[PDB]
Amino acid sequence: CGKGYHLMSFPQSAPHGVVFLHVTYVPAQEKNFTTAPAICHDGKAHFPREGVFVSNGTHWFVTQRNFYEPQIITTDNTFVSGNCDVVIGIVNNTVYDPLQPELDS
């Protein structure tokens, strides 16, 4: 039903037939980014739950697949699986812990 990601459709009557009006989702403006499959932190490999790791050139962010919305990489949106010596392309970056400033203060 249409080209793109389908959202809605509306039927219209026609002589000896029917007419569909497909409402779809089309991405418009894209930008290049530097990506990584995993992030090494304290000897652990962090994979994103939903989204993809991207870089600004300097800093690293986690972003959903179909839209640009960079977030700070924490432990809430990542999960740990294995070590850093098995994933090809793993980069080095820190992962924020929300419990540390609450326990410090």
Partner: protein, 99 residues
């Protein structure tokens, strides 16, 4: 001296029209669909083609069947060898059996 049936159909008024798309231009379409699938995934079927590494868009497709994406990243060489062996088996099956 060995007359074919094509000349009989030919002389009795039964002709065959050539197709509009030749075999050298179907292969260009399949090459475009192959180069769009490898380098972009499913992003070229919706809008513009968006580049993505193959080792990550294979992890996108393990998430669609209910498997976490660490399984691919911890077993990438095994899956690559299994795929290469599968293409070799298709090659042998097409080169051996004509049925």
């Amino acid at each position: 001296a060995a007359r074919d049936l094509i000349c009989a159909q030919k002389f009795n008024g039964l002709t065959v029209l050539p197709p509009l798309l030749t075999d050298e231009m179907i292969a260009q379409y399949t090459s475009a669909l192959l180069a769009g699938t490898i380098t972009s995934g499913w992003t070229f079927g919706a809008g513009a083609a968006l580049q993505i590494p193959f080792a990550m868009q294979m992890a996108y497709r393990f998430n669609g069947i209910g498997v976490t994406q660490n399984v691919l990243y911890e077993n990438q060489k095994l899956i690559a060898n299994q795929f290469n062996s599968a293409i070799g088996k298709i090659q042998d099956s097409l080169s051996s059996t004509a049925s």
